[PDB]
Write a protein that binds this ligand. Structure first.
Ligand SMILES: OC[C@H]1O[C@@H](O[C@H]2[C@H](O)[C@@H](O)[C@H](O)O[C@@H]2CO)[C@H](O)[C@@H](O)[C@H]1O
Ligand SMILES: OC[C@H]1O[C@@H](O[C@H]2[C@H](O)[C@@H](O)[C@H](O)O[C@@H]2CO)[C@H](O)[C@@H](O)[C@H]1O
Lengths: 162, 161
């Protein structure tokens, strides 16, 4: 029921691309679970949905981001009228977790990408690569390069105060 | 002596930027040693020098690359007439060593960059960052991003079959 759901092996422990996904929601349907994966950033490419976390209910649309971190009790559901499509990057590693603690997003776990954000292009590009993933053509190197670019862009656009 | 020689800590074991350097050579002077560092790619930005490895003697110039790998007995010397300047990136890690085994450059340890090579810009950019390295502005993330771009560019331009 996903356009794309590429799951990668966990062979790197400093920086690792765990999975890349694309899902068109069905109206009024979503997911309600305790997050098991290390970290999963979602980018809303179309339509509307809601993200519920820690007593707060966010009405998200095209351009918005939400991030799932291990242990979060979450619910995210497509709108009954105009159901969202989202792209996601799951990632892990000691370096990945250190870089996430340098961004302001890991508190509220929701954000909006600005006009000239570099984040949408990186997430879309990582999902594009994932559709024809070929490690013998060194797609593994390119995905890690993009993951470093993505975490740099998150810190650049959503900095924690120094 | 070196206008730049930034040495970094070895804290990453999958991919690590070990050092970045810029050296204008002195005529007829060079180095003659067994390489201790994991991997060190040099890009010749001007003049001429020679790289001697395993009985072969290479006359290099602007645009050329040579790579030092741990254990290589090497000699590299600036030309008397027109001494080279080179930029270098030292790097290590299991991923780094796997990706190096995917490029044809680790056979001869020498290459020439094509007209529109992406390699010069990356090495120059990593040395530029190294001059004002500020980890609290996440320069550490940017240098590893550039190292992944560099190894990708080496494989793209100098592939094994
Ligand atoms: O991981 C992003 C992905 O999450 C799916 O939800 C899964 C989750 O991945 C898995 O760890 C958990 O055990 O089950 C969840 C399904 O209830 C979403 O289905 C998918 O749309 C993405 O959001
Ligand atoms: O590492 C590139 C750098 O090497 C210098 O030579 C050093 C080398 O780094 C060190 O490991 C070894 O013990 O001694 C060498 C000096 O003899 C070069 O001086 C420098 O120009 C770069 O090529």
């Amino acid at each position: 029921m996903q356009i794309l759901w590429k799951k990668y092996v966990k062979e790197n422990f400093e920086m690792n691309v765990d999975e890349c996904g694309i899902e068109q929601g069905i109206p009024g349907l979503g997911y309600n679970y305790e997050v098991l994966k290390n970290a999963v950033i979602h980018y809303v490419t179309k339509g509307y949905g809601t993200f519920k976390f820690n007593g707060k209910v966010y009405n998200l649309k095209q351009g918005d981001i939400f991030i799932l971190l291990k242990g979060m009790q979450v619910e995210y559901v497509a709108s009954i009228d105009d159901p969202w499509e989202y792209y996601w990057i799951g990632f892990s590693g000691s370096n990945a977790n250190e870089y996430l603690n340098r961004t302001s997003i890991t508190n509220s776990c929701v954000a909006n990408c600005e006009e000239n954000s570099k984040i949408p292009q990186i997430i879309l590009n990582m999902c594009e690569i994932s559709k024809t993933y070929n490690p013998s053509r060194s797609d593994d190197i390119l995905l890690l390069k993009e993951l470093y670019s993505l975490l740099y862009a998150l810190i650049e656009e959503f900095p924690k105060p120094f």
